[PDB]
């Protein structure tokens, strides 16, 4: 029985480029987390309590996704390499602009997973594509959800009255088309 | 005991023009169904989640009405003839325009039933008028409901803020005067 | 943030040939639905109440599958295009012939999904293959089920007594190998 | 306040031909009752216990229908006139022949109601058409049910084995398409 790079028994070696891609993606999940924390704060600073609570939960969820990836590397007997985390964006001129950044962040998360997915297929790593399949499925739902929140905020067309109604929806947990 | 056109024992023959009228009306119910599906999609594309859920349920209800009619022909030992279904309308410039089409669709459904009703009376088919009586009663309630939804949307006068409030009413199931 | 063809925020563009293939497949699910409705009617006309109830439920399930696909296009910010629906087949000389058509309809549904799947892989659309994966899994179970119902009816070798026993199985919900 | 023919306060006079038609129809319901009793006995004599129980209940139901009509005449302040009741048919060469007589008996019951209905319309007696409307609705269901039982027995094509299976269905209360 061979030992993998993290010291555990190795079921099958992993291509180093694929390992680096996964380590890089863990950073993207962690960056999404701190970005949603920043967005939560921006919302709280403007008394948008429902948006604040939504993004506060979204930040914890993104961290959970990152940890989920670290567990996969452990399972594959590969080393984790937790990286320096950039500071998030923290300033937006409107809620609509913030929600656009949030949507792009989800689309960018999926793109990163897709890039890892393509590299795993290049290396015939079926464990990794199977591991990523449910995460892409969750990304479709997340993109649908953030397209819903962004589009609903844009529908409000900057009217504070409409944004308060949407804010109360989010505080109630009404955060998807349903 | 005579056998009816669908092969079952025949309680009483049905005039072929009346049969064709019923088969035609089944198509109208099926067309109402796919129209409400199209309207549900239009609403979902604009993040009008409550209107989407309402029309999604309305589409299933219209299909149930169609099946209810096929069961009556079975009960009368008459042949069903499921027809080609036209594509629905799929484009509207506003929610108010969509709701106007929806109201007209309900009024047109009732007109079709009324036409079948008149033909059954011409042929002294009391089974068919008795069968249609509760369906006309349900049409009155449906017309009242869609006049309510259309009128409430028109009252909003295109204000997104008011349409969001109405959207949330529909998501809660507040879809009639009550 | 770019807007997709249906107006929603776009996470990633979709190849137009892949979009048309998905729109075409939605038609196949809707056609399976009306085909199972026709089969339900054929069974009811022959007092095969269990087969009638089975196909009545199967028709609603196929419609649900179609709606599931329309929701995916919404999630991808792609336009739906609900198409004209052909009239179903409505005449069979025996229950065994009807069940053969039903089995082929399920196999043909899977073939259509497989064709969409191959086109998504050609375009590296991992969202679409992930979306279709569970639907292919459900197709395996559906093909297993309809091979079971077809084979059991063929085992009956046209004996009405055996078909009544099977009819009662279906009315009880005994519709799979289990 | 005028007194009606049965002595009670009279809300509106009834045409004597319409009264005789209703009195005649009460006889038809009573005759259906004793016919179903005879059919129950025929079935019991052949150990068809499920068919026996079905027709035993059907006989009581027909009597209830007759009483329902006598109550309407009371409500209209009209005299009842309970008539001599013919002896039922009591001999059949097969269960299929018996079920054909049963189906015709239901169709004939509806025809009698229809004849009363037409006479009430001739006399603009809207109380009577309203009273008969739900009874015609029940007749549609009864005709559907007896077409189902007759057709299922005919499907058995005289095989005792199939008739035993159907007999057990009826004993379990499985007496309609459902
Ligand atoms: Cl805004
Ligand atoms: Cl509007
Ligand atoms: Cl067969
Ligand atoms: Cl027989
Ligand atoms: Fe994530
Ligand atoms: Fe995310
Ligand atoms: Fe999978
Ligand atoms: Fe309808
Ligand atoms: Fe309707
Ligand atoms: Fe009525
Ligand atoms: Fe399907
Ligand atoms: Fe299927
Ligand atoms: Fe009766
Ligand atoms: Fe009866």
Report the separation in Å between the CA atom of B4 and the middle of ligand 6, taken as the mean of its atom positions.
62
Per DSSP, B5 falls in state T
CB pairs under 8 A between C and D: 38
D65 labelled binding-site residue: yes
User: Quick one: CA dihedral D2, D7, D9, D13, positive or negative?
Assistant: negative
DSSP lists the bridge partners of residue C3 as C9
Element (H, E) at A81: none
Residues in CB range of D110: below 8 A, 6 or more apart: B11, B12, B127, D136, D139, D143
Q: Determine the residue of chain B that is closest to D178 in CA distance.
A: B71
Angle of helix A49-75 relative to helix A160-171, nearest 10 degrees, comes to 50
For residue D2, count CB atoms less than 10 angstroms from its CB and return exposed for 0-12, middle for 13-18, buried for 19 or more.
exposed
- Mutate which: B8, B45, B52, vs C, most C CBs within 10 A: B45
The tokens describing B76, both together, are 């009368």
**Shortest CA distance to B57 belongs to which of B80, B79, B81, B32?**
B32
- Residue B83 exposure: Cα atoms within 13 Å on the Cβ side: 16
Question: In chain A, what residues touch C127 (CB-CB under 8 Å)?
Answer: 110, 136, 139-140
The tokens for A130 are 């199977």
- CB neighbours of A84 closer than 8 A, spacing ≥ 6? none
- Distant-in-sequence contacts of A52-60, Cβ < 8 A, 24+ apart: A53/A170, A53/A171, A54/A149, A54/A170, A54/A175, A55/A102, A59/A33, A59/A34, A59/A35, A60/A33
Span between the terminal Cα atoms of chain C, in Å: 49
The 10 Å Cβ neighbour count of residue B113 is 23
Which sign, positive or negative, has the C-alpha torsion D7, D8, D11, D17? negative
Q: C131, A141: Cβ pair inside 8 Å?
A: no
Contacts of B26 (CB under 8 A, 6+ apart): B66, B69, B70, B80, B82, B83
Contact residues on chain B for C74, CB-CB shorter than 8 A: 41, 44-45
How far is Cα B127 from Cα A6, in angstroms, rounded to an integer? 80
In angstroms, the CA C171 to CA A8 distance is 55
In contact, D140 and B131? CB cutoff 8 Å: yes
C148-152 long-range Cβ contacts below 8 angstroms, 24+ apart? C148/C176, C148/C177, C149/C54, C149/C99, C149/C102, C149/C103, C149/C175, C150/C96, C150/C99, C150/C100, C150/C102, C150/C103
Please tell me which residue of chain C has the smallest CA distance to D145.
C47
Cα C34 to Cα C29: distance, rounded to the nearest angstrom: 9
Residues whose Cβ atom is located within 5 A of ion ligand 10? B 133; D 133
* CB A43, CB A52: distance < 8 Å: yes
Nearest to A39 by CA among A100, A90, A1: A90
Sequence length of chain A is: 178
Identify the CA nearest to C63 among candidates C28, C39, C38, C90: C28
Q: Are D150 and B124 in contact (CB < 8 Å)? A: no
Q: Cβ contacts of residue D168 below 8 Å, gap of 6+?
A: D50
Ligand 2 mean position, distance from CA B95 (Å): 4
Nearest Cβ partner for B130 among D106, D111, D137: D137
Candidates A95, A77, A92; CA nearest to A163 is A95
CA–CA separation, A88 and B74 (whole Å):
66
Q: Which residues does A167 contact at the CB level (< 8 Å), separation at least 6? A: A48, A49, A50, A51
Of D162, D176, D177, the CB nearest to C161: D162
Cα distance between residue A105 and residue A143, in whole Å: 10
Asked if D72 and D21 count as a contact pair (C-beta separation under 8 A), the reply is: no
How far apart, in whole angstroms, are the C-alpha atoms of residue B82 and residue B69? 11
Torsion of CA D5, D9, D13, D17, to 10 degrees: -30
Which three-class secondary structure state does DSSP give residue A91? coil
Q: How far is CA A26 from CA A13, A70, B57, D28, in A?
A: 20, 7, 41, 83
Measuring CA to CA, how many Å separate B34 from each of B46, B173, C53, C82?
Answer: 19, 21, 23, 8
Check A137 against C126: CB less than 8 A apart: no
Rounded distance between C-alpha atoms, residue C82 and residue C97, angstroms: 30
Q: What are phi and psi of D105, to 5 degrees?
A: -60, -40
How far off is chain D from C81, nearest CA to CA, in Å? Answer: 36
- Please report the number of interchain residue pairs, chain B to chain D, with beta-carbon separation below 8 angstroms: 47
Residue A48 structure tokens:
């948008």
A36-61 per-residue burial string, b: 16 or more CB within 10 A, e: under 16:
bbbbbbbbeeeebebbbbbbbebbee
- How far CA C76 is from CA of C3, C8, C146, in Å, comes to 11, 8, 32
CA distance readout (Å), B11 to B116, C169, D104, D146: 20, 30, 7, 10
- Ligand nearest to the backbone CA of B130: 10
Is B75–D150 a contact, with Cβ atoms under 8 angstroms apart? Answer: no
Q: Are A30 and A38 in contact (CB under 8 A)?
A: no
d(CA B1, CA D97): 10
Contacts 24+ apart (CB under 8 A), C83-87: C83/B87, C83/C23, C83/C24, C83/C26, C83/C27, C84/B84, C84/B85, C84/B86, C84/B87, C85/B34, C85/B84, C85/B85, C85/C27, C85/C30, C85/C31, C85/C34, C86/B84, C86/C31, C87/B82, C87/B83, C87/B84, C87/C34
- Which of D103, D136, D147 comes nearest B126 by C-beta? D136
> Could B88 and C82 be called an inter-chain contact, meaning their C-beta atoms sit closer than 8 Å?
yes
Q: Do A161 and B165 lie within an 8 Å CB cutoff?
A: no
Domain locations in chain C as residue ranges:
1-178
User: Which of the residues A96, A147, A159, A165 would you substitute to probe the B interface, choosing the one with the greatest number of B C-beta atoms within 10 Å?
Assistant: A165
**Contact between chain D and chain C (3 or more Cβ pairs less than 8 Å apart):** yes
How far is Cα C14 from Cα C26, in angstroms, rounded to an integer?
Answer: 17
D9: phi then psi, degrees, rounded to nearest 5: -55, 135
Give contacts of C9 with chain B, Cβ < 8 Å. none
Nearest-CA distance from D85 to chain B in Å?
Answer: 24
**Residue C154 to residue B136: CA distance in whole angstroms:** 45
Closest-CA residue to A130 (of A139, A138, A122, A121):
A121
Resolution (A): 1.7
Size (chain C), residues? 178
Nearest CB to C164; choose among D165, D176, D178: D165
Task: Write phi, then psi, for D177 (nearest 5 degrees).
Answer: -60, -35
Tokens of D12: 């509106």
Inter-residue contact D110 to D143 (CB < 8 Å): yes
Ligand nearest to the Cα of A129, by number: 7
How far is it, in rounded angstroms, from Cα A118 to Cα A140?
A: 17
For residue A92, count CB atoms less than 10 angstroms from its CB and return exposed for 0-12, middle for 13-18, buried for 19 or more: middle
The tokens describing B67, both together, are 């099946």
Q: What is the distance between the alpha carbons of residues D26 and D46, in angstroms, rounded to a whole number?
A: 31
What stretches of chain A show up as alpha helix (H) in DSSP? 16-45, 49-75, 95-122, 126-155, 160-171
**Cα–Cα distance for residue pair B38/C67, rounded to 1 Å:** 10
Technique used by the depositors: X-ray
Tokens of B101: 């089409």
Query: Residue for token digits 């007109």?
Result: B111
Residues in chain B whose Cβ is within 8 Å of chain C: 6-8, 34, 37-38, 41, 44-47, 56, 60, 63, 67, 70-71, 74, 80-88, 90
Contact between D80 and D23 under an 8 Å Cβ cutoff? The reply is yes
């Amino acid at each position: 029985v061979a030992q993998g790079p993290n010291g555990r028994a190795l079921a099958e070696s992993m291509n180093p480029d694929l390992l680096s891609a996964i380590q890089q993606h863990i950073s993207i999940e962690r960056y999404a987390s701190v970005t949603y924390l920043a967005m939560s704060i921006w919302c709280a600073e403007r008394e948008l309590a429902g948006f604040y609570q939504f993004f506060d939960g979204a930040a914890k969820d993104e961290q959970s996704h990152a940890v989920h990836f670290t567990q996969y590397l452990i399972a594959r007997s590969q080393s984790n390499d937790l990286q320096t985390l950039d500071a998030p964006r923290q300033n937006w001129d409107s809620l609509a602009s913030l929600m656009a950044t949030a949507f792009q962040m989800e689309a960018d998360t999926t793109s990163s997973i897709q890039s890892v997915y393509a590299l795993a297929e290049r290396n015939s790593d079926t464990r990794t594509t199977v591991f990523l399949d449910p995460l892409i499925e969750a990304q479709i739902q997340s993109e649908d959800q953030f397209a819903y929140l962004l589009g609903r905020v844009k529908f409000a067309n900057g009217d504070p009255t409409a944004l308060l109604v949407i804010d109360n929806e989010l505080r109630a947990g009404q955060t998807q088309r349903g």
